[PDB]
Coordinates of C-alpha atoms and ligand atoms in Angstrom, one line a residue:
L22 CA -9.9 -16.2 -21.8
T23 CA -11.5 -15.9 -18.4
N24 CA -11.2 -18.8 -15.7
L25 CA -9.5 -21.0 -18.2
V26 CA -8.0 -22.7 -14.7
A27 CA -10.6 -23.1 -12.1
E28 CA -9.0 -22.2 -8.6
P29 CA -10.6 -23.2 -5.1
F30 CA -11.7 -19.6 -4.1
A31 CA -15.1 -21.1 -2.8
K32 CA -13.4 -23.1 -0.1
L33 CA -11.2 -20.3 0.6
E34 CA -14.0 -17.8 1.4
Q35 CA -15.8 -20.8 3.2
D36 CA -13.0 -21.0 5.7
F37 CA -13.0 -17.4 5.8
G38 CA -16.5 -17.3 6.8
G39 CA -17.6 -14.7 4.4
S40 CA -17.2 -13.5 0.6
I41 CA -14.0 -13.0 -1.5
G42 CA -14.1 -11.0 -4.7
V43 CA -11.2 -11.5 -7.0
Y44 CA -10.7 -9.7 -10.7
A45 CA -6.9 -10.3 -12.1
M46 CA -5.7 -9.4 -15.6
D47 CA -2.8 -10.6 -17.5
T48 CA -2.3 -7.6 -19.6
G49 CA -0.1 -9.2 -22.1
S50 CA -2.5 -12.1 -23.2
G51 CA -5.9 -10.5 -21.4
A52 CA -6.5 -14.1 -19.7
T53 CA -8.5 -13.1 -16.6
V54 CA -9.1 -14.7 -13.3
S55 CA -12.6 -13.6 -12.0
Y56 CA -14.6 -14.6 -8.9
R57 CA -17.5 -12.5 -7.7
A58 CA -15.7 -10.0 -9.6
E59 CA -19.2 -7.7 -10.2
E60 CA -20.3 -7.8 -6.8
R61 CA -19.8 -4.7 -4.8
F62 CA -17.6 -4.5 -1.9
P63 CA -16.7 -1.6 0.5
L64 CA -13.8 0.6 -0.8
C65 CA -12.6 1.3 2.9
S66 CA -9.1 3.1 2.7
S67 CA -8.7 1.8 -1.2
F68 CA -10.4 4.9 -2.6
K69 CA -7.1 6.7 -1.6
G70 CA -5.3 5.3 -4.5
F71 CA -8.0 6.8 -7.0
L72 CA -7.8 10.0 -4.8
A73 CA -4.3 10.6 -5.6
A74 CA -4.7 9.9 -9.5
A75 CA -7.5 12.4 -9.6
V76 CA -5.2 15.0 -7.7
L77 CA -2.5 14.0 -10.4
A78 CA -5.0 14.2 -13.3
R79 CA -5.8 17.9 -12.1
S80 CA -2.0 18.6 -12.0
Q81 CA -1.6 18.2 -15.7
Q82 CA -3.5 21.4 -16.1
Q83 CA -2.1 22.8 -12.9
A84 CA 1.9 23.0 -12.7
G85 CA 1.8 24.7 -9.3
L86 CA -0.7 22.2 -7.6
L87 CA 1.7 19.5 -6.4
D88 CA 3.7 22.0 -4.4
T89 CA 1.0 23.9 -3.1
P90 CA 1.4 24.2 0.7
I91 CA -1.6 23.1 2.5
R92 CA -2.1 24.3 6.3
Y93 CA -4.7 22.5 8.2
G94 CA -6.1 22.7 11.9
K95 CA -6.2 19.9 14.6
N96 CA -9.9 19.2 13.8
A97 CA -8.8 17.9 10.7
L98 CA -6.8 15.1 12.3
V99 CA -9.2 12.2 12.4
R100 CA -7.9 8.5 13.6
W101 CA -5.3 7.1 11.8
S102 CA -3.7 10.1 10.3
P103 CA 0.2 9.1 11.0
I104 CA 1.9 11.6 8.6
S105 CA -0.3 14.7 8.7
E106 CA -0.4 14.6 12.5
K107 CA 3.5 15.2 12.4
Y108 CA 2.9 18.4 10.2
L109 CA 0.1 19.9 12.1
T110 CA 2.2 22.9 13.1
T111 CA 3.9 23.5 9.7
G112 CA 1.4 22.3 6.7
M113 CA 2.1 19.5 3.8
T114 CA 2.1 20.1 0.4
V115 CA -0.5 18.7 -2.0
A116 CA 1.9 16.0 -3.4
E117 CA 2.9 15.2 0.3
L118 CA -0.6 14.8 1.4
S119 CA -1.1 12.6 -1.7
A120 CA 1.9 10.3 -0.9
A121 CA 0.5 10.1 2.6
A122 CA -2.7 8.9 1.7
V123 CA -1.4 6.5 -0.6
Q124 CA 1.6 5.1 1.2
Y125 CA 0.5 5.5 5.1
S126 CA -3.4 5.5 4.4
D127 CA -3.6 8.9 6.2
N128 CA -7.0 9.8 7.0
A129 CA -6.8 13.6 7.5
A130 CA -4.9 13.7 4.3
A131 CA -7.6 12.0 2.3
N132 CA -10.2 14.4 3.6
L133 CA -8.0 17.3 2.8
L134 CA -7.5 16.0 -0.9
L135 CA -11.2 15.2 -1.0
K136 CA -12.0 18.9 -0.4
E137 CA -9.7 20.0 -3.1
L138 CA -11.7 17.9 -5.5
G139 CA -15.0 18.9 -4.7
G140 CA -15.9 15.8 -2.1
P141 CA -16.7 12.4 -3.0
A142 CA -18.9 13.3 -5.8
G143 CA -15.6 15.1 -7.3
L144 CA -13.8 11.8 -7.0
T145 CA -16.7 9.8 -8.4
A146 CA -16.6 12.5 -11.3
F147 CA -13.1 11.6 -12.1
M148 CA -13.6 7.9 -12.0
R149 CA -16.7 8.5 -14.7
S150 CA -14.2 10.4 -16.8
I151 CA -11.9 7.6 -17.2
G152 CA -14.8 5.0 -18.1
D153 CA -15.4 3.6 -14.5
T154 CA -19.4 3.4 -14.1
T155 CA -19.2 1.2 -11.2
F156 CA -17.3 3.2 -8.7
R157 CA -19.1 5.5 -6.0
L158 CA -17.7 7.5 -3.2
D159 CA -20.4 8.8 -1.2
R160 CA -19.0 10.0 2.3
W161 CA -15.7 11.4 3.8
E162 CA -13.6 9.5 6.4
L163 CA -14.6 8.1 8.6
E164 CA -18.3 7.7 8.0
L165 CA -17.3 5.7 4.7
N166 CA -16.1 2.8 6.8
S167 CA -19.7 1.6 8.0
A168 CA -19.4 -1.5 5.5
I169 CA -23.3 -2.1 5.8
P170 CA -24.2 -5.2 4.3
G171 CA -26.5 -4.5 1.2
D172 CA -25.5 -0.6 1.2
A173 CA -23.9 0.6 -2.2
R174 CA -22.5 3.7 -0.9
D175 CA -18.6 3.8 -1.0
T176 CA -18.3 0.8 -2.9
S177 CA -17.0 -0.8 -6.3
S178 CA -16.4 -4.2 -7.7
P179 CA -12.9 -5.8 -8.0
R180 CA -13.5 -5.6 -11.9
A181 CA -14.2 -2.1 -12.2
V182 CA -11.3 -1.6 -9.6
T183 CA -8.7 -3.5 -11.7
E184 CA -9.9 -2.1 -15.0
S185 CA -9.4 1.6 -13.5
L186 CA -6.1 0.6 -11.9
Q187 CA -4.9 -0.6 -15.3
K188 CA -6.1 2.5 -17.2
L189 CA -4.4 4.7 -14.7
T190 CA -1.0 2.8 -14.0
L191 CA -0.4 1.2 -17.4
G192 CA -3.1 2.7 -19.9
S193 CA -3.3 6.3 -21.0
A194 CA -5.7 7.8 -18.4
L195 CA -2.8 10.0 -17.3
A196 CA 0.2 11.5 -19.0
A197 CA 3.1 9.7 -18.7
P198 CA 5.0 11.7 -15.9
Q199 CA 1.9 11.6 -14.0
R200 CA 1.5 7.8 -14.3
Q201 CA 4.8 7.2 -13.3
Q202 CA 4.5 9.3 -10.0
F203 CA 1.1 7.3 -9.6
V204 CA 3.2 4.2 -9.9
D205 CA 5.9 5.3 -7.7
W206 CA 3.3 6.1 -4.8
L207 CA 1.9 2.7 -5.1
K208 CA 5.2 1.2 -5.1
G209 CA 6.2 2.9 -2.0
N210 CA 2.9 1.7 0.0
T211 CA 4.0 0.6 3.6
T212 CA 0.6 -1.0 4.5
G213 CA 0.2 -3.9 2.2
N214 CA 3.2 -6.4 3.1
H215 CA 0.8 -9.1 4.4
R216 CA -1.7 -8.7 1.6
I217 CA -1.1 -9.1 -2.2
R218 CA 2.6 -8.3 -1.9
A219 CA 2.9 -11.6 0.4
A220 CA 1.9 -13.8 -2.6
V221 CA 4.3 -11.8 -4.9
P222 CA 8.2 -12.6 -5.0
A223 CA 10.4 -10.1 -3.7
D224 CA 12.4 -9.7 -7.1
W225 CA 9.1 -8.5 -8.7
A226 CA 7.9 -5.0 -8.5
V227 CA 4.7 -4.0 -6.8
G228 CA 2.4 -1.1 -6.1
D229 CA -0.7 -1.7 -4.1
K230 CA -3.1 0.2 -2.1
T231 CA -4.9 -1.6 0.9
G232 CA -8.4 -0.9 2.8
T233 CA -9.9 -1.9 6.2
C234 CA -13.2 -0.9 7.0
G235 CA -13.2 -2.0 10.7
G236 CA -16.3 -4.1 10.4
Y237 CA -18.3 -6.8 8.7
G238 CA -15.0 -8.7 8.0
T239 CA -14.5 -6.0 5.4
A240 CA -10.7 -5.4 3.8
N241 CA -9.1 -5.4 0.7
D242 CA -5.8 -4.7 -1.6
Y243 CA -5.6 -3.9 -4.9
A244 CA -2.0 -4.1 -7.1
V245 CA -0.1 -3.7 -10.2
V246 CA 2.8 -6.4 -10.4
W247 CA 5.6 -6.5 -12.6
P248 CA 6.9 -10.3 -13.1
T249 CA 10.1 -9.9 -14.6
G250 CA 10.1 -11.0 -18.4
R251 CA 6.4 -10.5 -19.0
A252 CA 3.7 -8.2 -19.2
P253 CA 2.6 -6.7 -16.1
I254 CA -0.4 -8.3 -13.9
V255 CA -3.4 -6.2 -12.3
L256 CA -5.6 -7.6 -9.7
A257 CA -8.1 -6.6 -7.0
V258 CA -9.2 -9.0 -4.1
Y259 CA -12.0 -7.7 -1.9
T260 CA -13.6 -9.3 1.5
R261 CA -16.6 -8.9 3.4
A262 CA -18.6 -11.1 5.7
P263 CA -22.0 -11.0 7.4
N264 CA -21.9 -9.9 10.8
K265 CA -20.7 -6.7 12.2
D266 CA -18.1 -8.1 14.6
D267 CA -16.7 -10.5 12.0
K268 CA -13.0 -9.8 11.8
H269 CA -10.9 -9.1 8.3
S270 CA -8.0 -11.5 7.4
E271 CA -5.0 -10.4 6.0
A272 CA -3.8 -14.1 5.3
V273 CA -7.1 -14.8 3.2
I274 CA -6.2 -11.8 0.8
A275 CA -2.8 -13.2 0.2
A276 CA -4.3 -16.6 -0.3
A277 CA -6.7 -15.0 -2.6
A278 CA -4.0 -13.2 -4.7
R279 CA -1.8 -16.6 -4.7
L280 CA -4.6 -18.4 -6.4
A281 CA -5.3 -15.6 -8.9
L282 CA -1.7 -15.9 -10.0
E283 CA -2.0 -19.6 -10.1
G284 CA -5.1 -19.2 -12.2
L285 CA -3.0 -16.9 -14.8
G286 CA -0.5 -19.5 -14.9
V287 CA 2.2 -17.0 -13.5
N288 CA 5.2 -18.7 -11.9
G289 CA 6.0 -17.3 -8.4
Ligands
MK7_301 C1 -8.4 2.5 5.6 O1 -9.2 1.5 5.2 N1 -8.2 2.8 7.0 C2 -7.1 3.8 7.2 C3 -6.0 2.9 8.2 N2 -5.2 2.3 7.4 O2 -5.6 0.9 7.2 S1 -5.2 0.5 5.6 O3 -5.9 -1.0 5.7 O4 -6.1 1.1 4.7 O5 -4.0 0.6 5.5 C4 -6.7 2.3 9.4 C5 -7.8 1.5 8.9 C6 -8.8 2.3 8.0 C7 -9.7 3.3 8.8 O6 -10.2 4.3 8.2 N3 -10.4 2.6 9.7 C8 -11.5 3.8 10.5 C9 -10.8 4.3 11.4 C10 -10.2 3.2 12.8 N4 -11.4 2.6 13.2 C11 -12.4 2.0 12.2 C12 -12.7 2.8 11.1

């Protein structure tokens, strides 16, 4: 049921000037669209969705975790910490840090939560526990964004991202209350309006998490999409490019998402 209908991904990535990786699954039928789906791409900020899921998994055994207040110093505030910079003098709860990491891609929040889990290896361990053998987080923010060609650090594949996203948002990897909280955080993301969401009709629910490394044309988005009247679709779109100064393209990500939905026969 993979690639029953061919779509012009090669032309798209040639127009972009790099590589595009796509994996999309119709959870009703199991039909899939797959293009470079098992290649590694840098995660960039997109690890923060899985980070929040790992926090929620821990909260299943720690009823007080989400409302625990976390104070932090000015040295925690790295580039692009738009929420946590406004609460430097007060602190925020674990749940607020999680929401900020997901919905505003807040870098200081992500590092604080990584510390709670035992660092990149602790998040990687959570991903292993749900059956993901591809994901690896190796470094903290901001070092994880280097996006070096051929470097497997801080990467996954579009397929493994989609499979893990499906387990966490629709499957049984989280308990039902935590699953719905993860979905609600993704639905409230503010950074993805020009990526997968731009390919999705406004009357369909979407949750997503973006990433943009800042070099090597490297940027991405993954999402769960609920078309009305049919089963949800899960998909991931990742990009990279050969030159350090190559720019990312939001339009290419939206275009790739459109081709994925077309390949699944989903009328938008
Ligand atoms: C994530 O990849 N981020 C965090 C933030 N939001 O972008 S998004 O695409 O996740 O929404 C800014 C870009 C990126 C990031 O952390 N970039 C680093 C800091 C800015 N200079 C380049 C590296």
